[PDB]
Amino acid sequence: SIDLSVDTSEYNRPLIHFTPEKGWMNDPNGLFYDKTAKLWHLYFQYNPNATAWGQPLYWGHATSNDLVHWDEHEIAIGPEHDNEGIFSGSIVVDHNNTSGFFNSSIDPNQRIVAIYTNNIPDNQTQDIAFSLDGGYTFTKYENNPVIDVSSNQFRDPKVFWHEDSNQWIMVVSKSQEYKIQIFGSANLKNWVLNSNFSSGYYGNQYECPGLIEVPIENSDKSKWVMFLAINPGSPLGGSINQYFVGDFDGFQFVPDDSQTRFVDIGKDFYAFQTFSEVEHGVLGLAWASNWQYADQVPTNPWRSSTSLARNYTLRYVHTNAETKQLTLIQNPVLPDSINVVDKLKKKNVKLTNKKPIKTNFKGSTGLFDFNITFKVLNLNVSPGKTHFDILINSQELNSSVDSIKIGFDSSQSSFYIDRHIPNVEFPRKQFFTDKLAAYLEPLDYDQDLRVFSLYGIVDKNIIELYFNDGTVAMTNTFFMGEGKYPHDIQIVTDTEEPLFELESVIIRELNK
Amino acid sequence: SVDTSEYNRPLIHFTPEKGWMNDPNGLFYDKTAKLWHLYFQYNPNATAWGQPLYWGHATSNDLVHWDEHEIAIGPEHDNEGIFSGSIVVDHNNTSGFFNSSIDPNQRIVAIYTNNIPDNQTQDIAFSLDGGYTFTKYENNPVIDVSSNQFRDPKVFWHEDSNQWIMVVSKSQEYKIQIFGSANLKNWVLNSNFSSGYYGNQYECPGLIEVPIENSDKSKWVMFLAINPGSPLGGSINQYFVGDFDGFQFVPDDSQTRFVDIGKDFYAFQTFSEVEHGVLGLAWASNWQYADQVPTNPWRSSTSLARNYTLRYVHTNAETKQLTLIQNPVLPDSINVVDKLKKKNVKLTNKKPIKTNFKGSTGLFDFNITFKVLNLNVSPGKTHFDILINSQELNSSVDSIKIGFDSSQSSFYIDRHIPNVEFPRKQFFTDKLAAYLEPLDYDQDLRVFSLYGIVDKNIIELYFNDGTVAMTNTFFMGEGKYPHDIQIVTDTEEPLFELESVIIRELNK
């Protein structure tokens, strides 16, 4: 509640994370790649009419050729009445016209079908629609719904083609029953229930399931990963994403273990979905906010951004000194051929209270990234201090400087963030957490020493952290006072002698 | 030698006189002596975790008044220590230590981890004087797996398989290992269990039969502690609900649930020889900052003892799930200095509930049942909070905050206190948790209940009738302690109706 027609974009609006022009966004929808058009598609839960979640609810639509530059198009799908809306869903490409929508020169791999939840008063169903113009306008299928279970709580279909069972698989969730329901079809129109899956952190409801085959990093081997979103049960706060690793025959998913693991342990990574028609590799992004405060954050005339797209692999990594576990790794996309305004490189800098690392750029795009590999040296240091931190500071406007903090404590072998900013108040802080997480284990040892790596990227209201080589991800929005945005970056310590040796430091000012 | 006890030291939570404490150990009840026993990981020589490590020892007759006794078990060398373990009562002398008039149910055996350089083993010891001095068994260790990471035995007698069961953890393998014995001396590996939130290591497992609230039915619960993997921060406790035949534990589902979603509830252990009901307590701190908190000449307290039951409760509007319920003990016959009762209070900014007690024991409790009324209120405000304030010393007042937001149907805490700094804050979280679902509906309205107890550095919250617990330590500036309690709102008209409010100043 700050409105007027005050537009915060200048200091708030991310530059390379997608953002709608005006209005409210949540779950990403119908993510696919168009092969012939060489084009990435982003759809999303969209309310254009308010800056919060809205009763007549649509699929918004953007395209990109590189996953950092977006064009906003007209609404893709709308509801029959203001009475409710077009909830989350996915898209597939029906190359072989198994659904029977094909004028005759509707290009294969441009033969586009959307599967989504249709939200009516007292009823949620799975409906389908098809696009003949490349995914810009859609036609709803005469005989919708394609699945109706007489339920008020049954949503978020993610479908994909699965060979060697020779069927379309739908992964949808019966939310309050805590079941991911797996359906089959040779048709996209007629569906059959194959199995029910229930595990991990229950919270309040199951939402937005995913099921996809992810490669193991070195081998030609892979595993199937079940993605599941829960809200409002998150042990961390409101909303969160989790995953399971195992097998899949087209009928039931069978996990390798019964352990719970989260995709991202930041506060702001929810409703994760994967992209369709990606050849070699797995790609996906999420809604980059948390349901407990997402509609109160001081941005206008929009709310919400998407996260960066991420490349998903599986890697055996040490969860403790002795073990190793096949772990979900994620790393950010970035075209490289993004603008580097200018940068700062240094090598094996032995960091002290006497020589901090400071950016000296002149001018500031809101957007920066920092990439560090470091060694923990043998040195006795008093329990506190604050074992090395990287500080992201604003311009010095209004006789104060706003800053967020990202550090690593070597006694706790843990990374941490502190997104607390003074004098910024908004409804439902209390749930806006400030201090977070992240225990790791060395990325490597080089001479019995302990080596870690860090990659972070700050847009304008959003910071994404990738610890080791994407072993764990931490996404968080941060706010900063009216007019202020990130201007420079320091790396500091209270230690007199060097405890941390930064083998490599690269700090970059980036631009659109 | 500044002593912070006057404003920091809990009054009814156990605390060692001097030195450092962590995991609670060898919890048992003595039937003939009518006495509760508390042992613990103890380093007397420093105010942090210490190389020569002992089992400390306290007794109580009511679980809120404690006598500190001499060390119960010590290690052979300063080189290491006596790690976590449990106690059982060998009524029928299956171990063969019995002069002849060593009373049954006073026939006491301690099972513990012996930490040596490069070696952790399970050893046993017996007490003939009522659990005050111990003798180590000649042929220790009772179990040795040639491991550096193998600890925290919890043992109990299990009929209908007719054996002693040991629940111990092979920490870095992520296995709770289940052993059997007719002996307490000779053990056989029966099964391995691996589930829930892995984190870094498995620690302090538990296995016990817990009643379902109304029926004569019950379930078996596996307790498991992990650190430093906790999704919330450092250390945390989790549980599983299922069956047990004496050989393998088989859970009803494969879901992860935590025992307490505060930052400071770890190494939970259950009491032995409790007839009807299940009782236990935990180390009331978090491993990432536990040795840096501003208290002297001690660090760490135990939590209150809790009564543990299982109840079918709504996790969402539609469902219900057999959930672990916990509630605090408190003798009732604790000193109530004075109190404040109110009924049917329709809260507004113009009707703030305030304590007016005169004088302050550090210790208070508050018990509230409330309705969320039908009323449009602007998104913010701060839907009703309860504020715990200090004395007004040094021209400032320190306070922690416990509230409930009706739009988010969630309770929350904010333990942030200005100007108090100590090593490794960064991990000291401040704002926490707690989504619930109504305890009841009375006329399509939504009813919740809250019970909280503040000692002097520790606050324990129990939402609904113990559906979820939230334990957190809080700190407050030099000299300051809780003095009074307010319940406030920013709403002009009443959004919350407090059906019942009881605020009490308590004492030893």
Ligand SMILES: *[C@@H]1O[C@H](CO)[C@@H](O)[C@H](O)[C@H]1NC(C)=O
């Ligand atoms: C919602 O937004 C769309 C803009 O595309 C508009 O056509 C419609 O009238 C709006 N509805 C309401 C109820 O504001």
Ligand SMILES: *[C@@H]1O[C@H](CO)[C@@H](O)[C@H](O)[C@H]1NC(C)=O
């Ligand atoms: C599907 O179409 C592709 C060519 O577009 C072809 O290679 C494949 O064999 C077809 N499968 C079926 C079942 O028609």
Ligand SMILES: *[C@@H]1O[C@H](CO)[C@@H](O)[C@H](O)[C@H]1NC(C)=O
């Ligand atoms: C799957 O879930 C539904 C949910 O109500 C249930 O009725 C059905 O029996 C389940 N089917 C299988 C095959 O487990």
Ligand SMILES: *[C@@H]1O[C@H](CO)[C@@H](O)[C@H](O)[C@H]1NC(C)=O
């Ligand atoms: C993702 O990474 C894999 C190899 O790790 C590679 O084949 C692919 O090019 C990447 N995909 C994208 C879109 O960058």
Ligand SMILES: *[C@@H]1O[C@H](CO)[C@@H](O)[C@H](O)[C@H]1NC(C)=O
């Ligand atoms: C960080 O830099 C290293 C160069 O040492 C490179 O391998 C890597 O691609 C960078 N990581 C990310 C996530 O951009």
Ligand SMILES: *[C@@H]1O[C@H](CO)[C@@H](O)[C@H](O)[C@H]1NC(C)=O
């Ligand atoms: C249990 O665990 C140990 C690993 O520590 C392993 O050697 C053994 O095979 C397992 N035994 C059973 C019966 O599962």
Ligand SMILES: *[C@@H]1O[C@H](CO)[C@@H](O)[C@H](O)[C@H]1NC(C)=O
């Ligand atoms: C704990 O609760 C049980 C009911 O499950 C009751 O019978 C028992 O006496 C209680 N014990 C204590 C110490 O409060």
Ligand SMILES: *[C@@H]1O[C@H](CO)[C@@H](O)[C@H](O)[C@H]1NC(C)=O
């Ligand atoms: C709180 O108060 C209610 C009476 O309204 C009572 O039933 C309950 O025993 C109390 N709970 C605790 C934990 O003191």
